Amino acid sequence: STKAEIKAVLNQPSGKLVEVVGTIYREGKPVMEVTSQFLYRGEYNDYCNTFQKVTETPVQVAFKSAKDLAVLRSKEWFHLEKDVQFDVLTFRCESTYKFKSANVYSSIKTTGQVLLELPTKEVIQVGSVDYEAGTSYGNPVTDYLSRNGKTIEESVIFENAIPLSSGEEL
Amino acid sequence: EPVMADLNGGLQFIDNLKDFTSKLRTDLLETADIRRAVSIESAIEQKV
C-alpha cells in the first residue's frame, strides 16, 4: 500500500513547484520513499496558498568557552528540560514555512530535538526547540546554526572523482 | 631610627592576594563577555 504526503508548494519565478514524498508501506512497515517534483509553468501570485516543509540539516554545535551556554539560554527558542552538563550538541531539526511574498515569510514554525552524546555512547535528549513567528525575513534557528556550528556531513566528496566506465559502451 | 613606613592600605591582611585578585579580574571579564556575546547574538537575531 502507499501513503503520500506533500512537502513544498512554492511559487518560483519559473512556476509553481510541487514536491510530493510518497512513502510506500508493506505489511505495516515502510519500505521506500519516492521524492517526486513537478512544476506548473507560468507566473503565479498565489502567496496565500503556498507553504514549505523542510527537514533541516543536523548541525553539531561544539561548545568550548563558558559564554556559549549563556547564549543559547538567552535564545527563547531553546528550552533545555534537564539539569545536565553538555560538551557538544547536535540539533536534528525540522521547519515549516509559509510565505507572504517572494522571499518574505508569513509564518515560521521551527521545532526540533537537541541531542547529547554521552561517553557511554547513550543518546539522551537534553531539550527541545520551539520557535514560532510571523512576518519574518529568515529563519533565526538555522542562521544561528549556520555560523556557530558545523553540519553533520555524511555526503563526503572525493578530491578527484573517478570515472566508472569509459567509451561508448554506455 | 631606620623607619619602615608601611603605607600599604591594609592589603597585608588579605590571604592569597594573587588568587583573590585573579578571580575578581576573571569574574568581571566573564561577566563582560556573556553580556557581550548575548547582545551580539540578540542583535543579529533581530536582523534575521
Side-chain angles (χ1 to χ4, degrees), chain A residues 67 70-71 75 137-140 143-144 147-148, chain B residues 30 33-34 37-38 40-42 44-45 47-48:
Chain A
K67 66 183 182 180
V71 169
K75 270 90 170 62
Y137 288 82
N139 199 4
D143 199 1
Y144 170 70
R147 54 185 174 181
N148 295 114
Chain B
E30 290 292 326
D33 60 349
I34 64 99
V38 166
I40 292 299
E41 291 291 326
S42 178
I44 307 169
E45 194 271 333
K47 291 183 180 180
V48 172

Side-chain angles (χ1 to χ4, degrees), chain A residues 57-88:
Chain A
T57 61
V59 180
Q60 182 176 3
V61 288
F63 285 157
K64 300 297 183 184
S65 68
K67 66 183 182 180
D68 295 332
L69 278 75
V71 169
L72 48 63
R73 291 182 289 113
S74 67
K75 270 90 170 62
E76 72 273 14
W77 53 262
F78 184 79
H79 182 74
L80 74 161
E81 54 90 23
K82 293 199 294 177
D83 295 331
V84 173
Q85 187 270 333
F86 50 88
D87 190 3
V88 68

Side-chain angles (χ1 to χ4, degrees), chain B residues 7-26:
Chain B
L7 305 176
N8 198 9
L11 284 169
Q12 67 271 18
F13 293 154
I14 292 170
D15 296 331
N16 60 17
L17 179 64
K18 192 255 183 68
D19 292 332
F20 184 76
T21 58
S22 293
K23 66 172 176 288
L24 290 181
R25 190 175 63 246
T26 295

Side-chain angles (χ1 to χ4, degrees), chain A residues 1-3 22-33:
Chain A
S1 179
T2 300
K3 291 183 181 180
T23 300
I24 285 170
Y25 290 169
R26 180 261 303 275
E27 294 175 352
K29 292 192 287 184
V31 173
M32 67 186 83
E33 289 183 353

